Symmetry: D3
Subunit: 148 residues, 6 copies
Amino acid sequence: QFFIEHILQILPHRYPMLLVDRITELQANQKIVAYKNITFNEDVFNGHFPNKPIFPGVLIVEGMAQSGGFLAFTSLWGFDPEIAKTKIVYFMTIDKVKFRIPVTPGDRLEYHLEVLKHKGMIWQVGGTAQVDGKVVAEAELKAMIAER
Amino acid sequence: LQSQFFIEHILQILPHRYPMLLVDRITELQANQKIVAYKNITFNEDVFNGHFPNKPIFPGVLIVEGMAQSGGFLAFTSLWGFDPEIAKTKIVYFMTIDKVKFRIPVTPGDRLEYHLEVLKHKGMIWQVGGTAQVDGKVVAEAELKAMIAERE
Amino acid sequence: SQFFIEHILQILPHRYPMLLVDRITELQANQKIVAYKNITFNEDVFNGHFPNKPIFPGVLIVEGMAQSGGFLAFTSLWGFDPEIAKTKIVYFMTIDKVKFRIPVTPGDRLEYHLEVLKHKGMIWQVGGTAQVDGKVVAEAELKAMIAERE
Amino acid sequence: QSQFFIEHILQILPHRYPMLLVDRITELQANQKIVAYKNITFNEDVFNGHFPNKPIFPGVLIVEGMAQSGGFLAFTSLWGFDPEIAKTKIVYFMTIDKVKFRIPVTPGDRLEYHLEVLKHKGMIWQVGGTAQVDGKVVAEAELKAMIAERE
Amino acid sequence: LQSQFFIEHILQILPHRYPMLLVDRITELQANQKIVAYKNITFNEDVFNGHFPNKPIFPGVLIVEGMAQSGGFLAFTSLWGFDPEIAKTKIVYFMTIDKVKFRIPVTPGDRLEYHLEVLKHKGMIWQVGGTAQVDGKVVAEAELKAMIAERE
Amino acid sequence: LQSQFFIEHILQILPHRYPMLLVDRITELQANQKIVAYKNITFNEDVFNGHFPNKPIFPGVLIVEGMAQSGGFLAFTSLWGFDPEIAKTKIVYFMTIDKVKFRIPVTPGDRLEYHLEVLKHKGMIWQVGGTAQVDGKVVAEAELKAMIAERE
Ligand SMILES: O=C(N/N=C/c1cc(Br)c(O)c(Br)c1O)c1ccc2ccccc2c1
Ligand SMILES: [Cl-]
Ligand SMILES: [Cl-]
Ligand SMILES: [Cl-]
Ligand SMILES: [Cl-]
Ligand SMILES: [Cl-]
Ligand SMILES: [Cl-]
């Protein structure tokens, strides 16, 4: 397992845009299973929405893109914080996303992504976000790693 | 129904609030058909503390969000017109997102212009599509379907 | 016995960034409560506690146990009543026998387990532990008092 | 140079969030004048309290943005775009005078700072000018800063 | 109308909220003449994250803002006493600032004391001037003109 | 070893940072014996947004935290003096907290004075006890046992 501290050593994202808390499964060039805890104590809930906290669907996707990003980094150079500290990640395409169940405080948002296709710095992954066994969202995306 | 709406009009229609209200002004609007709006991008926004340190790049997913909110405003006013009292008890869920492509990164100092056109709508379910533009160039394309629902 | 953030928001007066209970999984009147708060990196406290080493504050673990306990005491007397809830305030008088055994970090489901040690009138004494995946990460005893909002 | 983006502004000014009030610089003439701006969006924390339901960019923050522009002008005039010397310098602002507010600034506005050097003697720089939104003057003010060694 | 008001009272009179309410307590007040209030300066303020890293210094412009808010409080209570119901239908507008001097940097642990007197006043327009002090020493001087207006 | 330390010195000794650095200044410091410090309480602190709306009260658990940080500063410096290079490698952790009692609510405008005394110390293990005061009145009491550990 990779914990927050390791996640920090690979992903360029920081607060309040680092939406992955832990990595539970990793299989180079194949897939990755990870998650982020959802708590009321997040600033995003002050406006989405007042008196009715609902984790933004677009942030679920960002969390999936980030999980895929970690798969890309590690699959490319392994766990190398040195190289990681010079790159960043750009979103290229998002497609076929569907939300089925709203994610709320108290939820364990689990990301399940598999590599669809990749070449060089460009990676295309797809999968689902699950809560307690159920699919709350599915999506496909292509992200690109680049030098800062 | 007017065609130009300022931040105060937006706050009376959309349920979104800080830090998730991503539309500052509406420049033009055709009921049940089209809407053009924009959000200014400044370094003085909290998302930039983490995306990314020393390299402020407005998140691509937040661009989608702003396009969806533009559609949501279009949806609501096309349904009930500018009715703040009916609006204060509704929210908006994302149902789907398709064919989005990011062409140019958005940075502090940009005037991110949203252009959404209604592709199909029935009752509460609206499906809009369009682009996000900075200085007349297209920085993003997207298609999305969102649902308006009575808060309960 | 199962209360979600929405039910919690109606009883407790605490709001962001000081509402430290996300869900209530078990509740037995005048006896005990079991609730939890999710710990994620996406929380403002982690910007300074501490940079490059995220560790949920121990005093905030106690705060969450207090809120859980205050919630237990309140509903025990009046049940789920948003009305009365606005006319009352549960503040804590003492805290004691606190012990931190394990660090809580982003990714943990911080579970609160409080029971009613004793109560007399509006003064309630609760105690228990903070648990993460079965282990006891902390423990404490608290005495709260229920009063009229004012 | 003449045009600097947020990237360059970060290497010259010490100001950071939530006090970096200049997004880009569109004009720069050493020892003469500077034209820069900051976008005003609702998605800014200050709007949570100034004011609820009535978002109005604080007037003092406009004067601040103007002060930040003058400082970048002063610094660049002395050493040009030098991130390294930048880290060793300070620009204390000593006084502010003749500031008038004419039109409120709100979300959706492009706050353009127009400043010119009014006097430069030794380490003391005196600048003045206006803040403009869409060609109209929304505020004017005078400022005096001192260049010193950071510590 | 008394002369000591705490944050609870200031909240019911001034329209400013976090992170822009910069007056914590009013210690002295003379209708239409003068007021003495203060704001505690602590490191635990978001503004210090950027002003400046590893060198916390309270923004000079914010000290003026605090003096303005003190003036606004005096102005309002002078005209309507402690009236929260009417106070809710107003906001203050900065009209002018002049003669400001920043003599001493203000930092965490300082009790920023505001001293203002009415230089002129007629209707909603009030002109105040004075100093900001820390432990008896003048940290700043300023003159400002504000206006109380119907929020609509 | 001085007895007066300001925010810039506190920043070199404690690893705490916004929004968990709860000590603004140290007025008295006696090695292995005691420390007197304080934190200014202002409305301009994020914590008051939710504790509580329309009724700002400084969290009691945070008073404790501020007392512990003081005791922690006392601990480190009693052992190494003002050694920033070393402080950067150590970190103090709460082991226990006992006999905590809150007597008076803390609010904006208050100067929260920490008074901690060394009850016992052997190596990296320290037991401190004391009170939190506001204008000579005791608003809280507590005892803590801390541990000075490696930061790795
Ligand atoms: O008054 C207290 N907490 N909350 C009070 C309160 C909360 C809300 Br909401 C409210 O609307 C009102 Br009226 C309150 O008095 C409190 C907190 C800590 C204390 C510590 C020692 C003694 C008294 C205390 C009272
Ligand atoms: Cl959503
Ligand atoms: Cl992106
Ligand atoms: Cl801790
Ligand atoms: Cl203003
Ligand atoms: Cl300043
Ligand atoms: Cl408390």
